[model samples]
Target: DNMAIIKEFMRFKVHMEGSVNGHEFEIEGEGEGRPYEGTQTAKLKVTKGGPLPFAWDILSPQFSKAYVKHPADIPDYLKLSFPEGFKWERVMNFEDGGVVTVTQDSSLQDGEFIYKVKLRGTNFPSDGPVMQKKTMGWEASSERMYPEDGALKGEIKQRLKLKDGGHYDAEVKTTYKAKKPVQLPGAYNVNIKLDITSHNEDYTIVEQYERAEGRHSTGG
Candidate 1:
């Protein structure tokens, strides 16, 4: 059995498979380099598996429109690492970027674990938002690769406080499974579902469907 480990700022290979309404799909890609605070780039190799043409409907909204223009940027974030754990190469700043802090140990849990992350937005406590004290699992789901099954699972939670004294708690749990093996000329796909709850949004229950690797382009 093979196992995948995510080191700080290390690159990893990823493949996925899944479909909706019996339509076949493929998502071939690789993930590497921690570019920003709690984010990664997903260099993708996408293809349509079924008879249906590779229409925009199936492609990620953010990538579809930009695909023809920016081929490289069309893919999802390829890197996910923090400041302290791994060394960052390409430093790209997000709207509200924060320093990512990760913790992993055996005693705490079986698989990989994210202890905490103190992400202070570009702005300080003032009109600036503070998204700190973030543990790996607290805010965003820490991605763990399972080579035996060729899948990845991430569990995360977080607390956000705006400048207006508004605060909310969010938790996200997602499981990703490979659709099929990667053979020559074959593509990969992934199936993902998420249940999100936020305090500021009246604890609203937001359910969303995601593909091979989920993206934040649509606020997911």
Candidate 2:
């Protein structure tokens, strides 16, 4: 009975679709982290079919790739504004996923509610590719405000290195503001904008490449 459940989960695949600024993308992938396979093992199968007639199988894989689509609206450029003599650099280091922290700052006058997401970009094949990156950023969500709605805003400050031989120090600010009232537990459209500045030439390459690539593929 348990084996049947495991087999079903192993065969399951999930697909996700999203859009940005009228551009859309689709991603379909399988789940990872099968039970009893990780260091902290656990069982994930219905050994005895007691309630739901047929047994149910669950998949808890260690590492499963989920199809993801970065919407068309996400900007493709990290503008570099440098003083005379100093130039901009480009570096490419992308990670799979990161942590997200949500908080509400009551001290601020506007009662800022923020989501601080720390992401990384690096190549770590040996030793499990574990690298510590500092990506400090915050975004405001509509949860803080009601009928009046509000704007989502945040900034990303990154210090990273590329696989080839370049490093980057970059900062980017993003904002999203809705035109009308946002309903409770409902989806609403908004306008988004981004501005970026970098300290390394590597940043330029990733920046220019993004804008040039357009929203069709999103680097796969």
Candidate 3:
């Protein structure tokens, strides 16, 4: 059956676009298959500019739900590796800027994996009198299960902490329900919604973007 062939390989792709500190940024990448006991590399490029380097890393363990078992083992999954003065003029930086460190904390709640990520840095911009030493954070949760028919169902929630002292928060909720019988190592359906609120401002930014990818396939 075609189902047997589908399980031979896994292919995945992702695109991310959002604003941070009022600066717009984007990311596009894709990957195929997996390694036995190492990271599966993805080719990522940022079309819109930001503080991140051209090529950042996303460890394979973080891509799998199993990471929830050993969250502490996850390193700075996204590390910026670049040379000094390279693309410095186009990139955004904090005033009196210094190195930035990002860390992730995770917990399991009722079969769901919850993650809180904090970014600590120096010289970031601020609305108040004091300079915003830290400027960004993220809270996310994910749960996955399979029905008796072998179809997959997954839920994901992401909250992005924008500027304005956390007063402005952008939320993204995504639901993945297989339209057909999703064979192993194959892509599936994903629906996403964005609810972004700038409390101090009158308007809100709401948008939707979707893509298909094999995010839960197992190594063959």
Give the top-scoring candidate (lDDT).
3
> Per-residue lDDT of 1-220 in model 2, one digit per residue for the tens?
2232332112223332222112233322322322222111122221222122110100111111111111335321111000100111122222433221211111101211111111222233222212222222112111111112334333344333333344433343333232222212122222211112121222211110001111222232
Ranking by lDDT: 3, 1, 2
> Clash totals for all models, in order?
29, 21, 0
TM per model?
A: 0.25, 0.19, 0.30
Ranking by TM-score: 3, 1, 2
Error of 1 at 52 (Å): 7.1
Where is model 1 more than 4 Å wrong at Cα? Answer: 1-6, 35-37, 50-220
Q: lDDT by residue for model 1 over 87-113, one digit each (tens)?
A: 111111223442222122111113222
Per residue, candidate 3 scores C-alpha lDDT tens digits across 1-220 of 3222222233445444443333455545444432112123334445555444211211111222111111122211111110100000012122233223333333333323233323333333344212332223333323332333333234333333444554222222222222233332233222222221111111121111122222242332
* Total clashes in model 1, counting residue pairs 3 or more apart in sequence or in different chains: 29
Candidate with top TM-score is: 3
Q: Kindly report which residue stretches of model 3 are placed more than 4 angstroms away from their true locations once superposed.
A: 2-7, 35-40, 52-174, 181-220
Candidate 2 vs 3: which has more TM-score? 3
